[PDB]
């Protein structure tokens, strides 16, 4: 996050009288006098921009009030619970406060009311896969080993966009499942063809399962996408298993030539009852699963 | 500063520290990662380090929640090291990190087990369907190899074999034996069949191919279950 973090405080020592009611000083004068030592509790490694010079200013008013604006780029920790990935939502905190001074020495306050103190520029939103719904501003206390400190916090609420993973993982998995399901329509005697379907589709599902977590942290628990991939893997594996089953029951190696007549019960293998049931069952079971999964997982997170 | 001369000097520090990991039992390993603290120049005759508050000096370890590891325990140690120039103080803050296995179950173990189970399916196909059985065996072999390659690239080039390498090598051996089983059956039928007809648990009858397939259908899952039991018991 890139911010114009700006603070103000009253220092009676710097009271003066002169022509102008406000003195706009260079960044050096800020280093010449006392200023707060505010830091970010969850920050990791930020930089105060100094191009072309330190992006700082100081405005001393006649009554002694100061105004010390900065231009910071803070990159901070945002702990996440990726149980509902890629359909999760987060609240990334931004917590800041004094480092040296306890409650009795320095206390922070919001200039305007808490809701309207933190303002986000409309045009400024570099999020790619996320959506910034809003922010909640609050204040509180932290009791550390040294003492008690005031911590002023702003939680930015983010929601992920599912669009990337619909084509990255979900659509390839569903197409692979339907590709395996297509094997039911071919004749039973074409053993190499249906074996090719089974092995190749389960290979593809294994590849997708491996590549699904190419970006996530190596979390121990299983995400929603992992459950979806597992069920797709189960469906393709069941298709290959039932092909093996029906092949076990095939009697005559030769297929049906284009000149013969099949008597009813050189005879020929009848079309499998297993295939007849599966053609309508397996797609229906996949449809019911997909509807249940999407209905369950779309509507889980809170609202306003 | 304090009235009685006490001075407190605090610093928010982010530091990268070397933790030499022995990955022999990886990913079922526990790792001792330590942070050493010493005075640079002053000997122990000039400065003495200690932990304020005793064993309760270090705080915040319980609040740490790593995505992969879990901090089993932490330990503080104080001692003096006889450095080359002289005797110096030493403090050590050590953690025993234990790796979580669920991620490796989801990524590595489950596809390998499923591919071995897939390779077993070639025993339920007739001996004469060479195309189908060879497709099964070959496809399983390449899937095992590409899984192995996709795995081991994301690690240092350690010279020894890990636990995950042991599991993947075992799965590869099982798949290779599954394919060599069909090779044996085909050789027995089409290579030794006409010669035999012209000229003329206990092991099965090598002459009957159907007997070999029925025997394999029972032996391969049993052997794989035994191998899994031995592996998991040994490494856990």
């Amino acid at each position, epitope marked *: 996050i890139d911010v114009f973090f700006r603070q103000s405080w009253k220092d009676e020592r710097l009271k003066f009288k002169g022509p102008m009611t406000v003195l706009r000083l260079n960044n050096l004068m800020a280093s010449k006098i006392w200023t707060p030592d505010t830091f970010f*509790h969850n920050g990791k490694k930020s930089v105060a921009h100094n191009m072309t010079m330190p992006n700082k200013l100081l405005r001393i008013t006649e009554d002694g009030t100061l105004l010390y604006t900065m231009r910071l780029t803070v990159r901070a920790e945002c702990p996440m*619970h990726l149980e509902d990935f890629p359909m999760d939502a987060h*609240a990334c*905190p931004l*917590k800041f406060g004094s480092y040296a001074y306890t409650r009795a020495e320095v206390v922070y306050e919001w200039t305007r009311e808490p809701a309207r103190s933190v303002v986000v520029a409309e045009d400024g939103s570099r999020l790619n896969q996320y959506d910034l719904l809003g922010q909640t501003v609050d*204040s509180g206390i*932290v009791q*550390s080993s040294t003492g008690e400190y005031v*911590v002023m916090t702003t*939680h930015f609420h983010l929601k992920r966009k599912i669009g990337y993973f619909v084509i990255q993982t979900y659509l390839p998995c569903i197409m692979t499942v339907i590709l395996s399901q297509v094997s039911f329509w071919l004749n039973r005697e074409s053993v190499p063809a249906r074996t090719v379907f089974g092995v190749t589709t389960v290979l593809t599902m294994t590849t997708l399962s491996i590549s699904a977590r190419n970006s996530l942290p190596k979390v121990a628990y299983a995400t929603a996408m992992d459950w979806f991939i597992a069920v797709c893997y189960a469906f393709v594996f069941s298709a290959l298993i039932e092909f093996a089953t029906v092949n076990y029951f095939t009697k005559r190696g030769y297929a049906w030539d284009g000149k013969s007549v099949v008597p009813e019960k050189k005879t020929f293998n009848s079309v499998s009852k297993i295939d007849r049931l599966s053609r309508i069952a397996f797609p229906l079971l996949f449809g019911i699963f997909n509807l249940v999964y999407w209905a369950t997982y779309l509507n889980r997170e809170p609202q306003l | 500063l304090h009235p009685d001369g006490t001075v407190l000097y605090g610093l928010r520090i982010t530091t990268t520290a070397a933790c030499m990991m022995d990955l022999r039992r990886y990913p079922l390993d526990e790792q001792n990662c330590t942070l050493e603290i010493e005075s640079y120049g002053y000997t122990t005759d000039d400065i003495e380090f200690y932990w304020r508050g005793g064993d309760k000096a270090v705080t915040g370890v319980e609040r740490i929640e790593l995505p992969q590891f879990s901090i089993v325990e932490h330990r503080l140690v104080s001692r003096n090291v006889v450095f080359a120039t002289g005797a110096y103080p030493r403090l050590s803050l050590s953690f025993r990190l234990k790796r979580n296995i669920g991620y490796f179950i989801l990524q590595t173990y489950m596809p390998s087990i499923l591919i071995t189970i897939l390779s077993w399916v070639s025993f339920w196909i007739n001996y004469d369907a060479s195309a189908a059985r060879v497709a099964l065996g070959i496809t399983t072999v390449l899937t095992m190899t590409t899984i192995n390659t996709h795995l081991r690239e994301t690690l240092p080039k350690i010279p020894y074999v890990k636990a995950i390498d042991m599991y993947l090598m075992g799965c590869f051996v099982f798949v290779f034996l599954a394919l060599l089983e069909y090779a044996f059956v085909n050789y027995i039928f089409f290579g030794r069949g006409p010669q035999r007809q012209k000229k003329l648990i206990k092991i099965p009858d090598l002459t009957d191919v159907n007997a070999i397939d029925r025997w394999s259908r029972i032996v391969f899952p049993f052997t794989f279950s035994l191998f899994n039991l031995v592996y998991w018991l040994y490494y856990v």
Partner: nanobody
Amino acid sequence: GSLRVSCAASGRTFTTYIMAWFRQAPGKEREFLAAMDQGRIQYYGDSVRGRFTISRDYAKNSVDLQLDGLRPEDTAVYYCAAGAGFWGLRTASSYHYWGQGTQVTVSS
């Protein structure tokens, strides 16, 4: 009077979740009391700022509330809640886990 209300979690590690207490006086109006983060940062409601003190024990996976200066209007059912604060940290809608609740009564 002084009191201490404890809450212990079982079946999930709430180290990274935000643990909070809520109050319900008779009248169906859930009131926020206090909350504590992974970062030990404490938030309070304006009605009980400095009277109640929230604390967490991460090793035992529990949250405690020390109540001081109990007044007769504080009689209510206190609930223990956990969950990451999404659109919340002061609203019951953001917490996906709740306690059974405990009745507390003050008689002068």
